[PDB]
Design a protein around this ligand. Structure first.
Ligand code: SF4
Ligand code: ZN
Ligand code: ZN
Lengths: 752, 98, 131, 38
């Protein structure tokens, strides 16, 4: 349809529209017009991506500013979904407007997902792919080939072919999804990875993950290309704090330090070899360093620094190199003794928690390394590696971690904490000391985003409570509200089971994981629900270890045998590819009527973007509250930091952290208002957590379902499933849950 | 094959045990038989490869496969793959030449 | 051959109380038992095959880092910084002058460690400390 | 064994002293079986 807002014409790609979408669209426009940040929570059963793209894209095309749009997701899978939705809108707009307006939309991901090279795309890790692509695209091969054609160094045909054409002609006007982009590039032998990166500045809407916006290692390059007045959208940002924290975190192990020493020795040997034969390169680099130039000046735009910057760009010193690490040999000695200091600190016998300031003071005591040279460690190492002709960097890879540690610890002093534990795994014959550099304040990584950009929209399906996020992340919002879906007939049945058929309490507490009574009760619940669930049944466990243990007990007890009769069993695995294969098989079984049951982790890869709409998801079995591991040094330190700074109680945050993951999994079963399913939370502790659930889920949770039994819950599930199968009366939903064009005009007139 | 966790205490049979190594080869062959490119919509491999330079605190032992005192795998992951492999083979057999 | 005294070959397994010490002059590892028996009376030649530098028992100290080369760098650095000590304010904020000074003291350590010119460097250190 | 522990050497033995050594109706003469416990 094509309806009107106060002054903005927006073309919706569907003939019908939900009341929630119009209200959601109206609120977004007001936020953009008034400027500022907002937190909008909408039910997962109503089209959110289409509504966001429809209004935002219409907003830029109409207003003179023509503000660009920045869409941020949490995983690459969501990027493709948004792009497909993005393609849907433009196709509809092109048909309605009679012409294809000038519009460019691209997604941005890593080389691993966009490498068409037959030999470089067959790797099992993105780090190796980047190194090989850089070798063929750094420019050393091209320069060597130009000087001497006989050189055996190879190039990438896809990268070379781009130089023939101009940047503006890399792709035709329109929206190119990853599936479409690869097909188009393959037919013309071009590199999608370089096409998108060189084309970000020309895209009306650019879609990437949170890591490309929060992680300084890869954010700085992309952030420099995007505009400053563009619209920023945070989709599914209910776990944005975790992304922010991990952006400035590091872990060091005894093996890493041992490998670092080998790399340091190799660098010293290489420097000696270069000195004997080619000493002019060292002098040229030294002369530039004395002047005061940094990696940005020396390095060409075609090449990239060896060590990605680990700190935010605003925290990088703009002064010259301190001088202690100005020369190659002196820097190596500086680097070497730093590694030795780290090694001796790993021989502790008890957990030691220390602030960065204390660590620096002790370092300045045992050795004579000052704070300022450490801040330049990563910057200096990249220059040295660049000038040493290091075509193979397998040995020097370990030194990247050491350089990252030095810059991070010497840069930040507040909101960061260093943990040294003699036992990485408490259940180990021999101690395995580990050193963890942790970020406690999640607002540090997101602070630049909220200041650089004027308008930011934070939206998700299960972002509740909305007050905590402004508290946890230091920002203020013009408006924050949650919508309640106006569904004529209830489509989702949320229930809480506090005990089994025997009436014995059931919980997923780790200390009682190996309990015959609790395990059997959960297994009976799993079997009983599989009996009545028509097509698909998804089960989420608090942790992978709990799933591994409980599943094994079920196999011995014979519970899995009963499940095998009615549904195929697919289990999430640590290997990403195997889990993806399981999802394909799980979907195939549901489609063909064989029936399948998927066992996954509530905090795993499946829960972070994979949706089970319609037949795939009909019953969600939440086995316990997905609580974190309480006896963790990282979590305890963060809890204390939040308590002292933001006055957030430790118990409150723990409940909030677990509930958001439980709700996250709950909301991955509804796509439209015709989708239905049953959501069961199996734990005695969910009973008092009704107020903590999202508003649209709490509304559907009745008082009688606060504490149910396995037998009682099954009876309700059977009755609910039977009712949902009946033909819905159209008149019951003509203008109360779905609106036509005429109905929308009525709403506008009545409100005005 | 049934999914039971093999116990070293159990004596078993000498003749049949000779095929345990042979069955391992078939498992690798079956994995390749089932391995194929997956649609990017539900491609979990790309999600972890979206940023290849992510550096953060390692997950707790509760979020990792179980291990024993010696440090090697406890073996419970193998049965999970075995049941997963069984379902994949059964579904694949449906899409036969017929 | 990484946990035993090179001279008395007192393995740690049979002598868990064995403790190893190092001497700045030549940076050689010797167990405490050998130190007392050979140096209690007075200074004597180092008990090593190819080491003829005299040392005193009072000079022995425990090794901090597990790399002998870094120990030489740090101790030489400590000796140099005991004389060549300055701060940014000493040059009235002239970062260019401070950077040059840091290289000079850093270079002095490099030459002293590798003995490029021991005589001139040591003489250079001798004259500055009086100032 | 005690002497080795004093020197820090693990003793593969133990002191032997530590080892510790370790009515009506009688017309049913034998029909009644003693089902005392379950
Ligand atoms: S230029 Fe593109 S296709 Fe060639 S190796 Fe790099 S990422 Fe792969
Ligand atoms: Zn000795
Ligand atoms: Zn000696």
């Amino acid at each position: 349809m094509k309806f009107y807002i106060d002054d903005l014409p927006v073309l919706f790609p569907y003939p019908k529209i939900y009341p929630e979408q119009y209200n959601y669209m109206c609120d977004i426009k007001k936020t953009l017009d008034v400027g500022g940040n907002s937190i909008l929570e909408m039910p997962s059963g109503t089209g959110k991506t289409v509504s966001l793209l429809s209004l935002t894209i219409a907003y830029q095309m109409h207003y003179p500013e023509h503000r660009k749009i920045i869409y941020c997701s949490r995983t690459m899978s969501e990027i493709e979904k948004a792009l497909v939705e993005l393609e849907n809108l433009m196709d509809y707009r092109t048909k309605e407007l009679g012409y294809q307006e000038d519009f460019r939309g691209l997604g941005l991901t890593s080389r691993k997902n966009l490498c068409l090279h037959p030999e470089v795309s067959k790797e099992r890790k993105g780090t190796v792919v980047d190194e090989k692509c850089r070798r063929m695209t750094n420019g050393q091969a091209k320069r060597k080939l130009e000087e001497d054609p006989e050189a055996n160094v190879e190039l990438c045909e896809y990268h070379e072919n781009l130089y023939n054409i101009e940047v503006e002609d890399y792709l035709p006007k329109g929206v190119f999804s990853f599936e479409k982009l690869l097909k188009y590039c393959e037919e013309k032998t071009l590199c999608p990875y370089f096409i998108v990166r060189r084309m970000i500045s020309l895209c009306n809407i650019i879609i990437y993950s949170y890591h490309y916006l929060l992680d300084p290692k890869i954010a700085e390059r992309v952030s420099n290309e995007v505009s400053k007045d563009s619209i920023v959208i945070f989709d599914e940002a209910h776990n944005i704090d975790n992304v922010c924290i991990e952006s400035l975190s590091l872990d060091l192990t005894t093996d890493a330090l041992r490998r670092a020493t080998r790399g340091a020795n190799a660098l010293d040997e290489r420097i000696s070899e270069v000195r004997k034969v080619d000493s002019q390169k060292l002098q040229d680099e030294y002369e530039k360093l004395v002047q005061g130039l940094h990696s940005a000046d020396i390095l060409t735009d075609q090449e990239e620094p060896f060590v990605e910057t680990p700190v935010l760009p605003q925290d990088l010193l703009t002064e010259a190199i301190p001088g202690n690490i100005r020369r190659a040999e002196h820097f190596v000695s500086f680097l070497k003794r730093l590694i030795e200091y780290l090694k001796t600190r790993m021989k502790v016998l008890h957990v030691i928690s220390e602030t960065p300031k204390s660590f620096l003071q002790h370092l300045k005591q045992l050795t004579f390394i000052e704070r300022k040279p450490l801040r330049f460690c990563s910057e200096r190492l990249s220059l040295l590696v660049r000038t040493l002709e290091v075509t193979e960097v397998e040995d020097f890879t370990a030194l990247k971690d050491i350089a990252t540690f030095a810059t991070l610890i010497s840069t930040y002093e507040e909101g960061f904490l260093l943990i040294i534990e003699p036992y990485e795994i408490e259940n180990a014959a021999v101690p395995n000391p580990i050193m963890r550099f942790t970020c406690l304040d999640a607002s540090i990584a997101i602070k630049p985003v909220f200041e650089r950009f004027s308008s930011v929209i934070i939206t998700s399906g299960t972002i509740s409570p909305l007050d905590m996020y402004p508290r946890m992340l230091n920002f203020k919002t013009v408006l924050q509200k949650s919508y309640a879906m106006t569904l004529a007939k209830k489509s989702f049945l949320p229930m809480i089971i506090t005990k089994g058929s025997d009436q014995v309490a059931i919980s997923s507490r780790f200390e009682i994981r190996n309990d015959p009574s609790i395990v059997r009760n959960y297994g009976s619940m799993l079997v009983e629900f599989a009996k009545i669930t028509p097509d698909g049944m998804v089960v989420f466990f608090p942790s992978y270890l709990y799933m591994e243990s409980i599943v094994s007990m079920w196999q011995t007890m014979g519970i899995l045998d009963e499940v095998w009769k009615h549904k195929l069993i697919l289990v999430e695995t640590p290997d990403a590819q195997e889990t993806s294969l399981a999802l394909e098989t799980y979907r195939k079984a549901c489609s063909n009527g064989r029936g399948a049951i998927l066992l996954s982790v509530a905090r795993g890869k499946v829960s972070e973007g994979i949706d089970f709409d319609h037949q795939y998801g009909r019953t969600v079995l939440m086995i316990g509250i997905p609580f974190q591991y309480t006896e963790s040094r990282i979590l305890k330190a963060r809890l204390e930091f939040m308590r002292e700074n933001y006055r957030i109680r430790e118990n409150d945050f723990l409940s909030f952290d677990a509930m958001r993951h439980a709700a996250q999994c709950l909301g991955r079963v509804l796509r439209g208002k015709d989708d239905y399913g049953v959501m069961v939370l199996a734990d005695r502790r969910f009973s008092r957590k009704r107020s903590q659930l999202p508003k649209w889920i709490a509304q559907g949770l009745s008082d009688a379902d606060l504490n149910l039994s396995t037998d009682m819950a099954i009876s309700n599930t059977k009755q609910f499933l039977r009712t949902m199968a009946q033909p819905t009366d159209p008149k019951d939903q003509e203008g109360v849950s779905v609106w036509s064009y005429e109905d929308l005009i009525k709403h506008q007139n009545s409100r005005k | 094959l049934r999914g039971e966790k093999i116990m070293q205490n159990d004596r078993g049979d000498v003749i049949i045990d000779r095929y345990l190594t042979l069955d391992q080869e078939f498992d690798r062959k079956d994995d390749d038989m089932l391995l194929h490119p997956v649609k990017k919509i539900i491609d979990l491999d790309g999600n972890i490869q979206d940023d290849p330079v992510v550096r953060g605190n390692r997950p707790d032992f509760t979020m990792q496969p179980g291990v024993d005192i010696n440090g090697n795998s406890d073996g419970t992951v193998d049965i999970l793959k075995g049941m997963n492999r069984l379902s994949e083979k059964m579904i694949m057999a449906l899409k036969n030449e017929y | 051959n990484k946990d035993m005294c090179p001279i008395c070959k007192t393995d740690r397994y049979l002598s868990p109380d064995v403790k190893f010490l190092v001497n700045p002059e030549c940076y050689h590892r010797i167990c405490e038992s050998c130190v007392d028996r050979i140096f209690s009376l007075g200074p004597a030649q180092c008990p090593y095959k190819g080491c003829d530098k005299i040392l005193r028992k009072n000079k022995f100290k425990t090794q901090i880092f597990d790399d002998v080369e870094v120990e030489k760098e740090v101790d030489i650095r400590k000796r140099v910084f005991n004389v060549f000590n300055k701060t940014i304010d000493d040059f009235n904020g002239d970062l260019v002058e401070y950077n040059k000074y840091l290289e000079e003291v850093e270079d002095i350590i490099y030459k002293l460690d590798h003995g490029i010119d021991v005589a001139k460097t040591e003489e250079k250190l001798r004259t500055y400390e009086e100032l | 064994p005690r002497k080795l522990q004093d020197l820090g050497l693990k003793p593969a033995s133990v002191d032997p002293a530590t080892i510790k050594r370790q009515i009506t109706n009688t017309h049913m003469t034998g029909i009644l079986k003693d089902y005392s416990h379950r």
